[PDB]
Amino acid sequence: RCCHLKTIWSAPLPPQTEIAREMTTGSTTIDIMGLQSAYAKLHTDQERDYFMQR
Amino acid sequence: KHAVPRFFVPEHGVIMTLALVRFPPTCTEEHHYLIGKGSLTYTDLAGDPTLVGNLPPREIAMENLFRSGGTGTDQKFKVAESIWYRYHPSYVDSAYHLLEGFPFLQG
Amino acid sequence: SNVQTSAQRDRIDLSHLGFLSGQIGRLKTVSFSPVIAGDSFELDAVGALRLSPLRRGLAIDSNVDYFTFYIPYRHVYGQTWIDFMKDGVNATPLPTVTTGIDMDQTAYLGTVNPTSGIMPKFLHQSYLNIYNNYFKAPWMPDRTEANPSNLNDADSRYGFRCCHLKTIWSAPLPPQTEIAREMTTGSTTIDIMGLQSAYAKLHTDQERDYFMQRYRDVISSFGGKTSYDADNRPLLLMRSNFWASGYDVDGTDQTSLGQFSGRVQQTFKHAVPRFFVPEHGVIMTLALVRFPPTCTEEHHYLIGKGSLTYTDLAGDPTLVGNLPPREIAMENLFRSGGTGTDQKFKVAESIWYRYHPSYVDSAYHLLEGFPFLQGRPAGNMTERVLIDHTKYDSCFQSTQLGQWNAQAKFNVSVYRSIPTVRDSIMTS
Amino acid sequence: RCCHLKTIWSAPLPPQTEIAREMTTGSTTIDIMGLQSAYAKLHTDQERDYFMQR
Amino acid sequence: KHAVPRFFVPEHGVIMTLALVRFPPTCTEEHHYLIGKGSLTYTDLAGDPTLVG
Amino acid sequence: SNVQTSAQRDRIDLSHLGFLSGQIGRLKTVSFSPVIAGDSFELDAVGALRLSP
Amino acid sequence: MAKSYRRGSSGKKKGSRLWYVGGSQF
DNA sequence: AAAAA
DNA sequence: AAAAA
DNA sequence: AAAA
Incomplete structure (x- = not known):
């Protein structure tokens, strides 16, 4: 059995799609340079979820 | 007609x-989707x-798109934030429902 | 990281298919598309229209009309819509309406009824505004059903009943037509300057009975004009009119050698010029x-009156x-017509010298397969002008697709300032 | 009575101008995708404070 | 001088x-402002x- | 979100009025304008001078 | 006998991509 | 825009 | 390469 | 750089 022609329900986002991403900031402080690094790692994960699985 | 251009075979196969x-x-x-959601907010x-x-992907249920659709975990998936403004679905009148001879997905 | 604040103009495709069916003389929605302020909209519809198979060959062609309207959300919600856009993200959700429990309780709105029984009100309210401004007779009251669930089965399933094509009986003078106007002269004297004033006031009353029953008609008589936002009416974009024809099929077996069956199949086009959308709607x-x-x-009429005078x-x-309008009865035009108060209406003084009716021989009476009104239109004036689809049941063979069906493709192209799907799913 | 010609004191920023905007991060964690959504909502509020009050 | 171009009146008013x-x-x-503040920082x-x- | 690190060259108007008075043979400041490194400055003053009757 | 309204379910695509499933899918 | 194209 | 040729 |  093959797949239907692409529609909203027959071509959904892959099941490994996240709507949140957590960080480990301090109790009363945060590193903002570490915050920039967190966004960079999230971008590479989203590339492999939407475009690059092979 | 199904024509294939000339091909050089490099190995046995x-x-x-x-x-x-x-x-x-x-x-x-x-x-x-706007009909199925009912109560509309500014974002919708x-x-x-x-x-x-700038918003994360939204998770919707099958109920918002189909009559008698489900709500449980197996009837949930994620779409783009405003996908309903980029496509419009097809309409089948209720007179065609349960009528033999039309290739349709019943329900 | 990177916050987006604007978007390019992109070509959005909103094309879809439609499988449509309905009854004779009932208005039904076939397509809809929500729009955003600043859009550039264009529509083109191509399809084929069919009738149910006939009991005989083709005798009379039918007339088909297509309409397109634009309705802003401000006409539906009013001040609630104004506060909705000014508040922004934290605005209050818009009100809704209640629907039925069956799958076909909103077929007149061109959508399948959701199982929740709740839907937004802009489709239902826009349908009422179109009907009250363009399709009902100007002298009959408006339809003001609050929710789709307040309609009966016939209206929700197929739509509202419309008016017949204009004839002597289907387009009578409005019920507020006077044949006399009284004055208050003296016992043995009369003011003749007052008599001139009486005629002036009668002329303005007759203008509002025959021509100006809507506000925009009164302004038009002065030579001015009103925008569609002044009286809160829908804006018409395009109208199309065509006739449907077909061919015949011959029977070739022992029993049916010599009889024929007609089928109607007509292709059509409905093209709407490019439109600039000013507001959400x-x-x-x-x-x-x-x-x-x-x-x-x-x-x-001369045959039905019998005894003819010089005036006739x-x-x-x-x-x-120079004579006032004459009041006639249904008996003077139809066999077995009535004479009571509900079978009386008013016409022009010599209308019978300006038209001639069609003749149907008695051999055609009570014969299946011919689209005719058997006998006369019954009921009062309101029931006489509105079309009744159950009278045409003798012309078609029983089927699940009603009395007419169609299959069309709507080519919708819009220029929209919306971010791409890639922009929406990538955080950075 | 009408308004003076525009100067620094006769044409100030509207009284509904905020100098801070708070979020509801976790005790030792933060969602960074939620942080992006917070900036988007702040931008629309500032548009209606400076440009679009009608 | 205060001249108004020709206008078509659509309604009573x-x-x-x-x-x-x-x-x-x-x-x-x-x-x-710099005089009134007195003590000036790098940002000012x-x-x-x-x-x- | 978006951090700005540079700016374009813009035309700034620093025009103002002056109402001045003084005595004979005393030096007095009539106008001033703070400037930033890299600016391109130009000045032109037009007015009328009067003595007491 | 019927080309446009029997062939396909929508119009021609001249715009941005709409679906992303993780790769080629046929 | 009901009235052969 | 689903979307009249 | 994206309509990957």
Whole structure:
């Protein structure tokens, strides 16, 4: 059995799609340079979820 | 007609041909997302570019798109934030429901 | 990281298919598409229209009308919509309406009824505004159903009943037509300057009975004009009119050698010019199918009156153009017509010299397969003008697709300032 | 009575102008995708304070 | 002179004309912000584009 | 979100009025304007001078 | 006998991509 | 825009 | 390469 | 750089 022609329900986002991403900031402080690094790692994960699985 | 250009075979092997037949996916009991949600907020209807391009993907249920659709975990998936402003579904009148001879997905 | 604040103009494809069916003389929505302020909209519809198989060969063609309207959300919600856009993200959700529990309780709105029984009100309210401004008779009251669930089965399933094509009986003078006007002269004297003032006031009353029953008609008589936002009316974009024809099929077996069956199949096009959308709203398309109003037992007025006077027959211009409108009964036009108060209406003084009715021979009476009004239109004036689809049941063979069906493709192209799907799913 | 010609004191920023905007991060964690959504909502509020009050 | 171009009147109504007279807002006891603040920091005086914007 | 690090060259208007008075043979400041490194400055003053009757 | 309204379910695609499933899918 | 194209 | 040729 |  093959797949239907692409529609909203027959071509959904892959099941490994996240709507949140957590960080480990301090109790009363945060590193903002570490915050920039967190966004960079999230971008590479989203590339492999939407475009690059092979 | 199915014509294949001339090919140079580099190693021993096989060449296979296959076929596939499909219909466009039209469902009888399918409606617009805005119709299925009912209560509309500013994010749903305004189409503001700042909100559309900066929000995480939304999770919706099959109930919002199909009559008698489910709500449990197996009837949930994720779509783009404003996907309903980029496509419009097909409409099948209720007179065509349960009528033999029309290729449709009943329900 | 990177916050987006604007978007380019992108070509959005909103094309879809439609499988449509309905009854004779009922207005039904066939397509709709919500729009955003600043859009550039264009529509083109191509399809084929069919009737149910006939009991005989083709005799009379039917008339088909297509309409397209634009309705802003401000006309539906009013001040609630104004506060909705000014508040922004934290605005209050818009009100809703209640629907039925069956799958076909919103077929007149061109959508499948959701199982929750709740839907937004902009489609239902836009349908009422279109009907009250363009399709009902100007002298009958408006339809003001609050929710789709307040309608009966017939209205929700197929739509509202429309009016027949204009004839002597289907387009009478409005019920507020006077044949006399009194004055208050003295016992043995009269003011003649007051008499001149009486005629002036009568002229303005007759203008509002025949021409100006809506506000925009009154302004038009002065030479001005009103925008569609002044009286809160929908804006018409395009209208299309065509006739449907077909061919015949011959039987070739022992029993049916010599009889024929007619089928109607007509291709059509409905193209709407490019439109600039000024505000958020919806654009709706509707269809209407009607037959010319031919009645079997209808005769000439001079034949029905019998005893003819000089005023009836001479056609003298002095008498024709200076007499008040005459009141006639249904008996004078139809066999077995009534005489009571509900079968009486008013016409022009010599209308019978300006038209001639159609003749149907008695051999065609009570014969299946011919689209006719068997006998006369019954009921009062309101029921006489509105079309009844159950009278055409003798012309078709029973089927699940009603009395007409169609299959069309709507080519919708819009220029929209919306971010791409890639922009929406990538955080950075 | 009408308004003076525009100067620094006769044409100030509207009284509904905020100098801070708070979020509801976790005790030792933060969602960074939620942080992006917070900036988007702040931009629309500032548009209606400076440009679009009608 | 106050000339109004030809106008087509679409509905019944009224047309009104009004006037306003004003002076430029000059105040006697007004001084520069840098003079009034007195103690100046790097943000006040440097005019660094990164901090200003 | 978006951090700005540079700026374009913009035309700034620093025009103002002056109401001046003084005595004979005393030096007095009539105008001043703080500037930033890299600016391109130009000045032109037009007015009328009067003595007491 | 019927080309446009029997072939396909929508119009021609001249615009941005709409679906992303993780790769080629046929 | 009901009235052969 | 689903979307009249 | 994206309509990957």
